[PDB]
Amino acid sequence: MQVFIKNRYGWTITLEVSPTDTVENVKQKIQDKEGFPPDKIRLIYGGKQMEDGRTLADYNVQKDSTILICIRDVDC
C-alpha cells in the first residue's frame, strides 16, 4: 500500500498512504515526512496534476507506484 515520491532530480522517499486518501492528506503526510508546506507542492501522476479534493483511488494509484512531486517557486 506504500508508494514512492520522486522529484525531478531522482531523490525518492517512501510514503505509506491509503487508496481512500485524499491528495491533500497525501500532501500533509509529505509535510510530516519532509518539511514542505502542502500549499506549495504539486503532485503529478500519469501526467496530470493531482487535485487537492480527489482521492488516490480516482487516479488509480496502485501499490509501489511513483508520484512526481515538484515544489512551486523551487523548480516548477
Binding site: 525531478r8 531522482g10 501526467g47 509501489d64 507506484s65 511513483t66
Partner: peptide
C-alpha cells in the same frame, strides 16, 4: 537518464508499471 530523452524518462518514471 533524463538528459537524453527527458519525456520518455519522466514517463517511465511516473509510470513504473
Amino acid at each position: 537518464t533524463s538528459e537524453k530523452r527527458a519525456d520518455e524518462y519522466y514517463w517511465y518514471d511516473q509510470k513504473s508499471e
